[PDB]
């Protein structure tokens, strides 16, 4: 995942998401896709964890960002379906809204 060199190492010294924003969508209200897309992608509000920043990298945590166009299912239409990618567990919006 491409990430700038100013991403603090204190983000990486504890279990977090590999993108910037923490995906606390399980805490939000069930069967509400419209508001709960916002806590994953709308960067006008800060993190679930670190409320003094919006994302530790904007190049993967945004809705059309570089890490999102690589690993989401909306833009992997020409990919080989048999191979396995770890970041499909973190970037795929269909299974992120499953939780």
């Amino acid at each position: 995942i491409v990430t700038p060199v100013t991403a603090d190492v204190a983000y990486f010294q504890k279990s977090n998401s590999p993108r910037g924003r923490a995906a606390c969508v399980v805490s939000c209200e069930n069967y509400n896709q419209e508001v709960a897309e916002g806590l994953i992608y709308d960067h006008s509000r800060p993190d679930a964890a670190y409320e003094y920043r919006s994302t530790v990298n904007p190049w993967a945590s945004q809705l059309g960002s570089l890490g999102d166009i690589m690993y989401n299912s909306s833009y992997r239409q020409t990919a080989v379906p048999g191979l396995y990618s770890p970041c499909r567990a973190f970037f795929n919006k269909e299974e992120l809204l499953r939780n």
């Binding site: 204190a10 504890k14 964890a49 670190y50 409320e51 003094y52």
Partner: protein
């Protein structure tokens, strides 16, 4: 155990308010005091126009 910082930038929600910058309430508390200061100066409080 996350290491959240507290910048000056987080304290701008209260340091930028017109209640922290108005002197109206502290002067309302001082002018209504039952025992003010006894040593008054009148050295350079006001400009006199020559």
């Amino acid at each position: 155990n996350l290491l959240l910082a507290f910048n000056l930038q987080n304290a701008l929600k209260v340091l930028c308010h017109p209640r922290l910058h108005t002197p109206a309430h502290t002067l309302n508390s001082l002018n209504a005091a039952p025992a003010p200061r006894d040593r008054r100066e009148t050295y350079s409080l006001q400009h006199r126009r020559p």
